[PDB]
Design a protein around this nucleic acid. Sequence first.
DNA 1: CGTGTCAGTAGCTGTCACGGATGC
DNA 2: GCATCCGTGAGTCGA
Lengths: 174, 340
Amino acid sequence: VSGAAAAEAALMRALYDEHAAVLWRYALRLTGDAAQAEDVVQETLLRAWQHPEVIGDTARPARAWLFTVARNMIIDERRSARFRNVVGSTDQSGTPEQSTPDEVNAALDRLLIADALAQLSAEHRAVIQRSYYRGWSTAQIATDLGIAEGTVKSRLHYAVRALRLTLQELGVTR
Amino acid sequence: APVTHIWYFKGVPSRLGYLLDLAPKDLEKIIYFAAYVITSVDEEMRHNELSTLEAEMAVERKAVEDQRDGELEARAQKLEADLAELEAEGAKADARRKVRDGGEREMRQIRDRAQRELDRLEDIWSTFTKLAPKQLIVDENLYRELVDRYGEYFTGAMGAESIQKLIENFDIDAEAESLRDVIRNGKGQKKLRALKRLKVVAAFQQSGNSPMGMVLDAVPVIPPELRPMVQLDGGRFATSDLNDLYRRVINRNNRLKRLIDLGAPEIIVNNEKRMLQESVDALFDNGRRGRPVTGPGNRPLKSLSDLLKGKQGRFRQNLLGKVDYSGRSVIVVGPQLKLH
DNA sequence: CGTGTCAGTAGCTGTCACGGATGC
DNA sequence: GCATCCGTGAGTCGA
């Protein structure tokens, strides 16, 4: 009946009231973190509910089985995932903060490339700004501009060398 | 499972305690699964069945008393018969006094065991008779008996979902005008405590935002670059504490989902919901309630709210004071220099 | 994966003024 | 109705 289903909940609550705090103390010593001890306790009693063989015999101590299960859980937590990560905390002192370099070199190169780009024909500029600034393929630029494949190839081939001419005339390091 | 924002429960003064007129300690008992709370009670159905339930409770009490008196009579007669038998054996009267004191002790135990049951029934009937919403029931067995007997008449709950329901079954305008009626004409001793309550309630009334926001169904996760995980020169890793807080929240929430799917006993599910509440509380403001979640080395983990507090917070450290094109060096007196 | 005789923190108070919500 | 107790604050810049 329904009382038969309520008796199981009463039994779980009884084993709670008799073993939960002691198991929490044990896991707390083995881990040192109370929030981890609570998790170990919940998982251990969950496995106790899933094993009626441990809850059947009252004349046999289930506390020892609980301690063994908790010990195995805690040693399983102590492997690779903890191994790598558990070491440092950014909020904790002694850890260097991340930094990003300044964009000075990139900005200067961008300025010189813009200057060299201004001295190009509209065709060559509109091709190099579609191959390197937009990252399209050769056939994609050929489809967009309505020109041939080899036409895009040749325009790129010359515009690269024209930019090199301008940069070497301005003294840009190779 | 719904959770409460620790800023509005534990933060002084307790905003929820001002909204629902609930004491702070009572609210603490409710949220963390230490006492049930009555959300609703069918008072008319209780009135239309009060006579029948009263007669049944009286019959039960009468049966308890009859059983007590029968057992006591049996024990007293056995005691007298045993004393007569040990007198026929010729034992010394002091041993008879030992047996007599033992019998009186046993009868006292029987009478007390019956009186405790009578008092439990008295408390059950008294609680069901005077049952109203927002009432607390700290005794779990008493609430269990109430549900077993008169469960058709009331509805109660625990944890944060109960407070969510109470906020849902809350008349903002009516409570506001009740506080106003107390404020217009009242004794200052009991009027200041209503003034501050109105300060809390009229905000939710006028602004148009529901107080339901104080109970959360989903928690936001800050972008990863604001809680970055860096690699160390020794091959190991070092992450932000916010990652640990979010991770514990996720772990306990997934375990709660498992327990809900498996139909685990209500004790496990409730004790898991409490841990989820504490995990969200630590994520938002660790250490605000109870002892803070310690990391490796008994170091309290920094919470989201810790990113804004004090001299090291965002405001004073990165907003009120920040610069390029600057230097510094030792100073030396220069007499030949002009003032400018 | 299975688990089954005792099996139970470290640490710590060597801060304080002050105001007001919280509580017997 | 009041003693208790909780939570708040407590210089700045350095290599």
